[PDB]
Design a binder for this molecule. Sequence first.
Ligand SMILES: Cc1cc2nc3c(=O)[nH]c(=O)nc-3n(C[C@H](O)[C@H](O)[C@H](O)COP(=O)(O)OP(=O)(O)OC[C@H]3O[C@@H](n4cnc5c(N)ncnc54)[C@H](O)[C@@H]3O)c2cc1C
Ligand SMILES: [Zn+2]
Ligand SMILES: [Zn+2]
Ligand SMILES: [Zn+2]
Lengths: 739, 13
Amino acid sequence: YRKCEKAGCTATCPVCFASASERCANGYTSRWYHLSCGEHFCNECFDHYYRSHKDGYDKYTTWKKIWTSNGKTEPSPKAFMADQQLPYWVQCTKPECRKWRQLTKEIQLTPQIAKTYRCGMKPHCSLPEDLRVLEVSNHWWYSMLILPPLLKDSVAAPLLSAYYPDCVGMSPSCTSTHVPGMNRYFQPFYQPNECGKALCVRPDVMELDELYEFPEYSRDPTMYLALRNLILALWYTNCKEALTPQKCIPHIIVRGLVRIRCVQEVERILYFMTRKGLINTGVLSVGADQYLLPKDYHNKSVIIIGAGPAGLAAARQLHNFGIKVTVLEAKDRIGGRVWDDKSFKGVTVGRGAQIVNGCINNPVALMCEQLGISMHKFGERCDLIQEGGRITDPTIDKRMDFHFNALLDVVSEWRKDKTQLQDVPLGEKIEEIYKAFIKESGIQFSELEGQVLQFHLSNLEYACGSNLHQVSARSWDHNEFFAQFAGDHTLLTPGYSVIIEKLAEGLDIQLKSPVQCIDYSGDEVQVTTTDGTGYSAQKVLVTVPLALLQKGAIQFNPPLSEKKMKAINSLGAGIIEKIALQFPYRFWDSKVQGADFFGHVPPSASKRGLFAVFYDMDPQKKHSVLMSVIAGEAVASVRTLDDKQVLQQCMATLRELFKEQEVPDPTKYFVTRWSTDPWIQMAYSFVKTGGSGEAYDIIAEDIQGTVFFAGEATNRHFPQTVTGAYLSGVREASKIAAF
Amino acid sequence: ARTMQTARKSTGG
Ligand SMILES: Cc1cc2nc3c(=O)[nH]c(=O)nc-3n(C[C@H](O)[C@H](O)[C@H](O)COP(=O)(O)OP(=O)(O)OC[C@H]3O[C@@H](n4cnc5c(N)ncnc54)[C@H](O)[C@@H]3O)c2cc1C
Ligand SMILES: [Zn+2]
Ligand SMILES: [Zn+2]
Ligand SMILES: [Zn+2]
């Protein structure tokens, strides 16, 4: 042979890369060995390492012991050569030529070497780049590669210790196979055999999004998974600055021509991950010169309706991409249901959203890291004080919490293989099963046991934002079929307003501009304000509250479909309200002893959602601001009263709870009225009897690639929350940006 | 959704 015996090689007469032997053939050799179309090695050099009597046999056996321990892939001289002998390839640093050069065999490539390389740098640019370089760009080129590239010293490696390196794009021979410089809430990768955790990715498996966008790696994914995994790690170790191709390339360390493929591909993958919002997001803001996506994406215009978390998330993204965005907001402020009172001494208290439920991988957690801000993790302790002063017996709460969960356990048994039509309110179902235990057991509940049960139901009502007789037994917890956000529940101490303001910074936002009509029967979208001002763009994104879609505040033309409307009306616009009280001194410290909150056992069944729980707004235990919630039927019981009457009502409750002392009068308070705020009229969505969690998906479907929908009530995995809304913003920005 | 519960959350099913 003076030619390659592998089917279809573009090399009629090959050169050896290795030079391991003195007997290294330009010339004839029994067999050539094919690694790539531009890269071959002779049988002398093959014998050099493979054969006992030869010199390189030492190296190869050493290497094959290491490779068998760490990796799953089979040791072989081909493998050895690809891992250990093939030359490195480096592009030039200087922008004039940027030509790819081969390094001499005796030199190991490193990040700093690849950062600062000019043509012919021994430890010049007029010489023409190697023939094989342009051939690397061909489709089939990757097809004629014996082995998938394996990366050396990958930033992702510490994160991936539980996997075999080769099963995940990495070299099992690399010495460098909670990490330093990484937030405890950033866990981007699933561990092997780990149950559902929100936003995690499998490092060894392409996701469906990735398969559809990159179907060429359906056959062989390992080059993809290596580069994705690297990028994710680069992003999560340095999430305050834009990840760019320039910053990635120095971390791709693999020998051979395949390195050039890697470098060219890393750019497409990066843009895909940016658009999707997996990388280069949060409150990262880019300067006016720079944009996160290339000029191709920029010939699009968007108007975004609503400037809550959903509308702001989408705006920020699209802005950062280089797309033209303008935001129209009904109120005289941004934030929607994020609205923070800054006027209390020391602490900061939200009128809407303030807790984060599950920080791990939560985009809110990433934004807190970016702005260097604090989250207070909630403690477990919450004692239930009764109207009178008696902290409930520990063995009473424990067992009523048990009984409560068993009811729900019976509900989920009941609901199997039922249909929307067979559905029934969760509240009815609960009490039915409740009466059954009474009857079939014979044992009855005391007045206290009953009161403590009621507290637990009110927590459900708080969670749903409704009386349980409105909430679907079949589907109330639908979203839990999906992976939820793991980790800490935290109080967001400086408030979500810091985040909301940062997101908003330097965007085209029009306040006091409610939209009245949206016309998309034309070529352009036509958007009209209540006063009459007109805006037009190629695409529009509605992010208004569920309750306003239900009231039909906006005229759509064409109207929404009967399907969309059935979706919209099958969900409930849930409601809670809050009260915040200031005091001169912390009157609860003695009794409460530094818990984040304390319970309140409802005196009667009909007073159930009336200040069920009081939150201590100072993690520092210095200031005296309490916060409390009104939920369920209690919200109805408070519709008529004015703030003062409510405040008194709250005060009656506190003096009864803290009987054994003098309760000081409040110096400062607010009472929230979200339900009557004409542009909001709710706190969060929930599934009504008869409904399905598919409603979210339906509400989320764009009309004719021009009208798009984001928001709290469009996020099936993560309904109700700032995180959910934010993520729906990022999801829609991604579709809008596409093509 | 119960994913809104912070204090004394349900483990129902
Ligand atoms: C009291 C309360 C407590 C909450 N607690 C939490 C919590 O602890 N953690 C959490 O994650 N979430 C919590 N939530 C829910 C969270 O606030 C919302 O789910 C989230 O804000 C939804 O964001 P959004 O973008 O979908 O909707 P919004 O924030 O409501 O954005 C809607 C925006 O659209 C504007 N708009 C309406 N109609 C028009 C129009 N025609 N033209 C232009 N603009 C219009 C509105 O003015 C509003 O600014 C709470 C909410 C409330 C009310
Ligand atoms: Zn060949
Ligand atoms: Zn040779
Ligand atoms: Zn050069």
